[PDB]
Design an enzyme around this catalytic site. Structure first.
Site, PDB file in Angstrom:
ATOM      1  CG  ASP A 351      -1.843   1.198   1.277  1.00 49.87           C
ATOM      2  OD1 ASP A 351      -2.804   1.260   0.482  1.00 49.87           O
ATOM      3  OD2 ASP A 351      -1.603   2.079   2.130  1.00 49.87           O
ATOM      4  NE  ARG A 489     -10.239   2.418   1.538  1.00 52.30           N
ATOM      5  CZ  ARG A 489     -10.736   2.590   2.759  1.00 52.30           C
ATOM      6  NH1 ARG A 489     -11.999   2.273   3.018  1.00 52.30           N
ATOM      7  NH2 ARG A 489      -9.969   3.083   3.723  1.00 52.30           N
ATOM      8  CG  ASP A 703      -1.785   1.954   6.384  1.00 58.47           C
ATOM      9  OD1 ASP A 703      -2.119   1.595   5.234  1.00 58.47           O
ATOM     10  OD2 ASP A 703      -1.830   3.143   6.762  1.00 58.47           O
ATOM     11  CG  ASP A 707      -3.880  -2.150   2.582  1.00 59.37           C
ATOM     12  OD1 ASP A 707      -4.067  -1.991   1.357  1.00 59.37           O
ATOM     13  OD2 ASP A 707      -3.447  -1.247   3.329  1.00 59.37           O
ATOM     14  CG  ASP A 800      25.757 -37.541  14.378  1.00 60.11           C
ATOM     15  OD1 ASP A 800      26.861 -37.261  13.867  1.00 60.11           O
ATOM     16  OD2 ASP A 800      24.988 -38.402  13.901  1.00 60.11           O
TER      17      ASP A 800
HETATM   18  N1  LIG Z   1     -12.126  10.160   5.014  1.00 57.17           N
HETATM   19  C1  LIG Z   1     -12.241  10.396   3.687  1.00 57.17           C
HETATM   20  N2  LIG Z   1     -13.272  11.110   3.190  1.00 57.17           N
HETATM   21  C2  LIG Z   1     -13.392  11.352   1.873  1.00 57.17           C
HETATM   22  N3  LIG Z   1     -12.520  10.916   0.948  1.00 57.17           N
HETATM   23  C3  LIG Z   1     -11.434  10.192   1.308  1.00 57.17           C
HETATM   24  C4  LIG Z   1     -11.235   9.881   2.730  1.00 57.17           C
HETATM   25  N4  LIG Z   1     -10.105   9.157   2.813  1.00 57.17           N
HETATM   26  C5  LIG Z   1      -9.624   9.011   1.553  1.00 57.17           C
HETATM   27  N5  LIG Z   1     -10.420   9.620   0.654  1.00 57.17           N
HETATM   28  C6  LIG Z   1     -10.185   9.662  -0.810  1.00 57.17           C
HETATM   29  O1  LIG Z   1     -10.371   8.362  -1.373  1.00 57.17           O
HETATM   30  C7  LIG Z   1      -9.222   7.959  -2.119  1.00 57.17           C
HETATM   31  C8  LIG Z   1      -8.945   6.472  -1.916  1.00 57.17           C
HETATM   32  O2  LIG Z   1      -8.456   6.216  -0.600  1.00 57.17           O
HETATM   33  P1  LIG Z   1      -8.014   4.718  -0.211  1.00 57.17           P
HETATM   34  O3  LIG Z   1      -8.652   3.823  -1.247  1.00 57.17           O
HETATM   35  O4  LIG Z   1      -8.328   4.513   1.251  1.00 57.17           O
HETATM   36  O5  LIG Z   1      -6.405   4.652  -0.376  1.00 57.17           O
HETATM   37  P2  LIG Z   1      -5.430   5.938  -0.410  1.00 57.17           P
HETATM   38  O6  LIG Z   1      -5.785   6.696   0.848  1.00 57.17           O
HETATM   39  O7  LIG Z   1      -4.035   5.363  -0.401  1.00 57.17           O
HETATM   40  O8  LIG Z   1      -5.759   6.660  -1.690  1.00 57.17           O
HETATM   41  C9  LIG Z   1      -8.076   8.841  -1.649  1.00 57.17           C
HETATM   42  O9  LIG Z   1      -7.221   9.203  -2.737  1.00 57.17           O
HETATM   43  C10 LIG Z   1      -8.742  10.063  -1.054  1.00 57.17           C
HETATM   44  O10 LIG Z   1      -8.711  11.133  -2.000  1.00 57.17           O
HETATM   45  F1  ALF Z   2      -2.273   3.819   0.019  1.00 60.99           F
HETATM   46 AL1  ALF Z   2      -3.836   3.235   0.651  1.00 60.99          AL
HETATM   47  F2  ALF Z   2      -5.408   2.663   1.277  1.00 60.99           F
HETATM   48  F3  ALF Z   2      -4.228   2.557  -0.952  1.00 60.99           F
HETATM   49  F4  ALF Z   2      -3.446   3.904   2.259  1.00 60.99           F
HETATM   50 CA   LIG Z   3      23.079 -39.730  14.997  1.00 59.30          CA
HETATM   51 CA   LIG Z   4      28.448 -38.743  12.760  1.00 58.06          CA
HETATM   52 MG   LIG Z   5      -2.874   3.236   4.261  1.00 58.59          MG
HETATM   53 MG   LIG Z   6      -6.072   5.259   2.266  1.00 60.48          MG
END
Ligand SMILES: Nc1ncnc2c1ncn2[C@@H]1O[C@H](COP(=O)(O)OP(=O)(O)O)[C@@H](O)[C@H]1O
Ligand code: ALF
Ligand SMILES: [Ca+2]
Ligand SMILES: [Ca+2]
Ligand SMILES: [Mg+2]
Ligand SMILES: [Mg+2]
EC number: 7.2.2.10
Length: 994
Positions: A351, A489, A703, A707, A800
């Protein structure tokens, strides 16, 4: 509070006398900590030392020597009075080698268990609570939680104690309680009371059990019981069924153990069968039944000598050693096969946000609409100072600190960030630093709102604690938050429905404040806010917006961008169903663009180096993120996954692009691409599964809760110590230090453990085979007996034992992390490696019968000089055609047998020196590279010198001291076993495959 699920929310609040939105007073906590005590457990128990020793005597190979030691003890009662002393020693020799390996095992286990507990207890578990001490939710230790205080939990959190749900701040609250109720799939919780007090935990759909995880949503609740009184604490102090299980590599060795236990068993009977004609010999003088016992004792003694005793122990020792070495590097090894699996790992999926980066979010850039003409569009960009989460910074417009409230577009923007937010901020009095409460992306907005003192709130006279959420609380009092549509997501956005507080904005109506990924949010915008006005979204405007997203995203800062919009005219509150999140996106349509924030998220310093080290070991590093593709690629370049100018059009896909590909092409793309962005949790596992279709050992690193499927799907899951409890639960190894380089160290460790097992086998086989072929050679050539059963046991103890176990402490080769990973198809023992066993075994076997024949023939000062009469030594009793006329009982001398015993021990001590590596020379890899081995050899060597010179000993072992010239002969034959394997090491390294 027993049966708190039976009572309603109102009755539970009044039961402890607590205000739901306020929490316990500092005096109430004092009384409850005195009445209910701390929320913890008496550390259960632990691995008993007496039970830690009994595990050393459970394997088959060890139990074999077990039955042997008993048989030798039982057979000792049938021993004649003249030769008693020799018989009593036999079972002790067999039993002593078992204890020797038992000590090393238990000792190494204790050190491993300590290093683990010194890492698990290092970082104290925290929990979110509402108390009268502070207005916002504060962070306290889980051990200080008591029934009463209000506790907050969101997605990925671990439930601290038994919680009675007071309010669910989301449309759905799913909880993973498989650790208790056993049910795998997450269950839905509610706030309605369960009237049945005798109901099971599964029926408690309003309770949050300790030790479980929140799979989705966010709720508020009051604690019902803590400590031992917890539903999971009732079974912790008793039902302690361990989840212990042997690793795949351990099973592969135990299989190989029984494979030898059958072969050795066959060649032992082969000894007792080719010596039936000696059952009636003058050497024994006994009947046809007495002579059979002796060669039966030989077979058993030869079995013990051949059977690997350290093998079941050295694998447990090396495993425990690896666990300790990982705990040393702050790595919690949750599952034993974790280390060995990372040795085979060819692909590491990871990630981005929070894993490859520090997850230290801070908004540094933001822009709103300035002016919109027919085809012209300008933006009011701003700069924010401060990298931490401290509410200390300035909004900079053209290098000038500006008042946020001056720009109406910033007023709405700050309003959105504070209202569309499940996370908060909390100041730590101990460390003297502001800590996030919840998601880092959201808290970054919280600190922005604090720096964006829009309504010019007096904050200079507030304490560090009150300064944390001062400006945010102001906005919360402006609009009433009706409900929230949680971040999903698939939609990649989050919404919050708000109504005016019947004061200033009362003559407007309801609003929805949307926040999410720029792509989706902007596509759902039909207008744009210009200050307080509104104009229709058009082409040039939309293009101008996205152009700045791309700039900040793919820039040298690689900013994580986020769009902010609002729905001026939301649907009727009764015209929206909150049962399915699939309808949430439609509720976030017809939006009006307000602004975009861009926050920096610096990659961890140890990542770029780690990826390069992985590349040297032939391991790919694939980024799988839900973030923007532009940002994802830009960061890949910064960490070394991609070149700074490398074309990545064929090596980088979005979730959308990846789905447009045929299934066959998706599989092909996984071994090609190294960067996947804008990806759903389904994609992460799907990518991993694709790599596993090529029979590659895949690892997952993450994290977040997104994931967890990929962490479960992969051969080994690695979670960040600062990650969610959900991610950790679905992992095999936790990086408490969040050190990415520890992953590479775990790889080397796994490769080292496997290599140490090879040289352990390479030694113990090539040596014990030589012992077997030595016995058969004497019976084949016609030469007299070389060793007695008691002498066979002695060789076993000396050769041994510790010299074998010490090989588990061998250093890694010079090219262990510069060679491609071992294929799963690769067999335990190569055909070439089996020839290595017979080549060494054949020599040391003929080197022992050669030294015994040397004393009979070529020996000068040695009493007895004959020629070609060793073949026919049982003839002189009845016929002596070519005999000089010497003694007729010279062939029963203990001197030539002691020579054979001396060489057999010495040539194996030399053979152990060749077991420091597989193909590396003894010069390239010096013998002093393993001090533990040399200390074992000298101990074994000296113990052999005691058996020869300490007056009572050589009589019991039927031996005689060797002259200084005789020992030179021993070394003359033993030492060149180094050169033999040295040549074999030269062939495989140069003429074959290094
Ligand atoms: N709490 C939140 N509220 C609204 N949008 C969010 C929030 N957290 C993340 N996002 C948006 O959703 C997208 C996808 O996030 P996620 O799939 O969790 O992995 P990452 O955070 O690595 O992109 C992010 O790029 C971010 O722009
Ligand atoms: F980078 Al991520 F959820 F895709 F923290
Ligand atoms: Ca032996
Ligand atoms: Ca031996
Ligand atoms: Mg993360
Ligand atoms: Mg994220």
């Amino acid at each position: 509070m027993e049966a708190a699920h039976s009572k309603s929310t109102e009755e539970c609040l009044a039961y402890f006398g607590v205000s739901e939105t306020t929490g316990l007073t500092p005096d109430q906590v004092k009384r409850h900590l005195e009445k209910y005590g701390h929320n913890e457990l008496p550390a259960e128990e632990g691995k008993s030392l007496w039970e830690l020793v009994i595990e050393q005597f459970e394997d088959l190979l060890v139990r074999i020597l077990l039955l042997a030691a008993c048989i030798s003890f039982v057979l000792a009662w049938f021993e004649e009075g003249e030769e008693t002393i020799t018989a009593f020693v036999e079972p002790f020799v067999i039993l002593l080698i078992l204890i020797a390996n038992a000590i090393v095992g238990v000792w190494q286990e204790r050190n491993a268990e300590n290093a683990i507990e010194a890492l698990k207890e290092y970082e104290p578990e925290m929990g979110k609570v509402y108390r009268a001490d502070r207005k916002s939710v504060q962070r306290i230790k889980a051990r200080d939680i008591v029934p009463g205080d209000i506790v907050e939990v969101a997605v990925g959190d671990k439930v601290p104690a038994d919680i009675r749900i007071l309010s669910i701040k989301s449309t759905t609250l799913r909880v993973d309680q498989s650790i208790l109720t056993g049910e795998s799939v997450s269950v839905i919780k509610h706030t309605e009371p369960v009237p049945d007090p005798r109901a099971v935990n599964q029926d408690k759909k309003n309770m949050l059990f300790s030790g479980t995880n929140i799979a989705a949503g966010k709720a508020l609740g009051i604690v019902a019981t803590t400590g031992v009184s917890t539903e999971i604490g009732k079974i912790r102090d008793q039902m302690a069924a361990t989840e212990q299980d042997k690793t795949p590599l351990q099973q592969k060795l135990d299989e190989f153990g029984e494979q030898l236990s059958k072969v050795i068993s066959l060649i032992c009977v082969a000894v007792w069968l080719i010596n039936i004609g000696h059952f009636n010999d003058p050497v024994h003088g006994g009947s046809w039944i007495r002579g059979a016992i002796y060669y039966f004792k030989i077979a058993v003694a030869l079995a013990v000598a051949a059977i690997p005793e350290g093998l079941p122990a050295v694998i447990t020792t090396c495993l425990a050693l690896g666990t300790r070495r990982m705990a040393k590097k702050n790595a919690i090894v949750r599952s034993l096969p974790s280390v060995e699996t990372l040795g085979c790992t060819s692909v590491i999926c990871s990630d981005k946000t929070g894993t490859l980066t520090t997850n230290q979010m801070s908004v540094c850039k933001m822009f709103i609409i300035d002016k919109v003409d027919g085809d012209f569009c300008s933006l009011n960009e701003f700069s924010i100072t401060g990298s931490t989460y401290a509410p200390e910074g300035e909004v900079l417009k053209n290098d000038k600190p500006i008042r946020s409230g001056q720009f109406d577009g910033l007023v709405e923007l700050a309003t959105i960030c504070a209202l569309c937010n499940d996370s908060s901020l909390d100041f730590n009095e101990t460390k003297g630093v502001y800590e996030k409460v919840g998601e880092a992306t959201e808290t970054a907005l919280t600190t922005l709102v604090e720096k964006m003192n829009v309504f010019n709130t007096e904050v200079r006279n507030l304490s560090k604690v009150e300064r944390a959420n001062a400006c945010n609380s102001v906005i919360r009092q402006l609009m009433k938050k009706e409900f929230t549509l949680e971040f999903s997501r698939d939609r990649k956005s989050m919404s919050v429905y708000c109504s005016p507080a019947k004061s200033s904005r009362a003559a407007v109506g309801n609003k929805m404040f949307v926040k999410g990924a720029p792509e989706g949010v902007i596509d759902r915008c039909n207008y744009v806010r210009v200050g307080t006005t509104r104009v229709p979204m058009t082409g040039p405007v939309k293009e101008k917006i996205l152009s700045v997203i791309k700039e900040w995203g793919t820039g040298r800062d690689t900013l994580r961008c986020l769009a902010l919009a609002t729905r001026d005219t939301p649907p009727k509150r009764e015209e929206m169903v909150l049962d399915d999140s699939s309808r949430f996106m439609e509720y976030e349509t017809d939006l009006t663009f307000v602004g975009v924030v861009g926050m920096l998220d610096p990659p961890r310093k140890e990542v770029m180096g780690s990826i390069q080290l992985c590349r040297d070991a032939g391991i790919r590093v694939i980024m799988i993120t839900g973030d923007n593709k532009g940002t994802a690629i830009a960061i890949c370049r910064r960490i070394g996954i991609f070149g700074e100018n490398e074309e990545v059009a064929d090596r980088a896909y979005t979730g959308r692009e990846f789905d447009d590909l045929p299934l066959a092409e998706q599989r092909e793309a996984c071994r090609r691409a190294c960067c996947f962005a804008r990806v759903e949790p389904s994609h992460k596992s799907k990518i991993v599964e694709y790599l596993q279709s090529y029979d590659e050992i895949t690892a997952m690193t993450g994290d977040g809760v997104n994931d967890a499927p990929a962490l479960k799907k992969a051969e080994i899951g690695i979670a960040m110590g600062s990650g969610t409890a959900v991610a950790k639960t679905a992992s095999e190894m936790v990086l408490a230090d969040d050190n990415f380089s520890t992953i590479v160290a775990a790889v080397e460790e796994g490769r080292a453990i496997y290599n140490n097992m090879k040289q352990f086998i390479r030694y113990l086989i090539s040596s014990n085979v030589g012992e077997v072929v030595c016995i058969f050679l004497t019976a084949a050539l016609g030469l007299p007996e070389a060793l007695i059963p008691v002498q066979l046991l002695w060789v076993n103890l000396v050769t041994d034992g510790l010299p074998a176990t010490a090989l588990g402490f061998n250093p890694p080769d010079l090219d262990i992390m510069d060679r491609p990973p071992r294929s799963p198809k690769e067999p335990l023992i190569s055909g070439w490696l089996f020839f290595r066993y017979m080549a060494i075994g054949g020599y040391v076997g003929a080197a022992t019968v050669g030294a015994a024949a040397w004393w009979f023939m070529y020996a000068e000062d040695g009493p007895g000089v004959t020629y070609h009469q060793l073949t026919h030594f049982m003839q002189c009793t009845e016929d002596h055609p070519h005999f000089e006329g010497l003694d007729c009982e010279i062939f029963e001398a203990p001197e030539p047998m002691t020579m054979a015993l001396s060489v057999l021990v010495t040539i194996e001590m030399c053979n152990a020196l060749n077991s420091l590596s597989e193909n590396q020379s003894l010069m390239r890899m010096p013998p002093w590279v393993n001090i533990w081995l040399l200390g074992s050899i000298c101990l074994s060597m000296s113990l052999h010198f005691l058996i020869l010179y300490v007056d009572p000993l050589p009589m019991i072992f039927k031996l005689k001291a060797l002259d200084l010239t005789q020992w030179l002969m021993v070394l003359k034959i033993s030492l060149p076993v180094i050169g033999l394997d040295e040549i074999l090491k030269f062939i495989a390294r140069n003429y074959l495959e290094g």
